A = this chain, B = another copy of it.
């Protein structure tokens, strides 16, 4: 029986750009039960703090509320493993919240057939409730994809910052499937939104 192998902290993510969460992979537990903790050091301060919330994001995670999360700081995260035999610390992770932003999928996807005179379908969706695009703090960009019921090729349309988009090249008759996803002005793409489907008039 031996002290815990070295733990491996791999993924941090920020859903809203005001909080963020970190997840760790436990090391070889050397045969015994192992208690974990996370400690971190902000850029500027020479003071090390312990994680504020081991409960909010669940098992093997650390959640940083607005109060603890500051953007444009490099965090130096390290995770610690202690059992009865000994204890070991992981390699330090340098984390900068600014570049770990990955938002939830868009909601309230809606589809309408409209006509101005020709006829077009237009997609209308909303962002995640947690991101704050209203105050300009979180600016967001969207994409949409469409394909007929039985196909293996989606067509992609970048919609900018518009939570709507009118589509014109659709063929009258067959039903189409549509999905959106979002991105921060600078960030990562989200998981696609629950698909909607509508058939198109003749």
The chain A residues found within 8 Å of chain B, CB to CB, are: 120, 137-138, 155, 157-171
Contacts and interface: CB of A to CB of B under 8 A. Distances in A.
A163 B160 CA distance: 13
21 contacts: A120-B160, A137-B160, A137-B161, A138-B160, A155-B164, A157-B164, A157-B168, A158-B163, A158-B168, A159-B168, A160-B165, A160-B166, A160-B167, A161-B166, A162-B167, A162-B169, A165-B168, A165-B169, A166-B169, A166-B170, A166-B171
Nearest to A138: B160
Contacts of A161: 137-138, 157, 159-160, 165-166
A46 to B, nearest CB: 38
A159 B171 CA distance: 14
B169 A164 contact: yes
A170 B168 CA distance: 10
B171 A162 contact: no
Nearest to A165: B169
Contacts of A166: 155, 160-161, 169-171
A171 B168 contact: yes
A157, A160, A161 interface centre (most CB from chain B within 10 Å): A160
Q: Which of A137, A159, A163, A171 has its CB near the most chain B CB atoms (within 10 A)?
A: A159
Given A160-B167, A162-B168, A166-B170, 19 more contacts: A137-B161, A138-B161, A155-B166, A157-B162, A157-B164, A157-B168, A158-B163, A159-B168, A159-B169, A160-B166, A161-B166, A162-B167, A162-B169, A164-B169, A165-B169, A166-B169, A166-B171, A167-B169, A168-B171
Contacts of A171: 166, 168
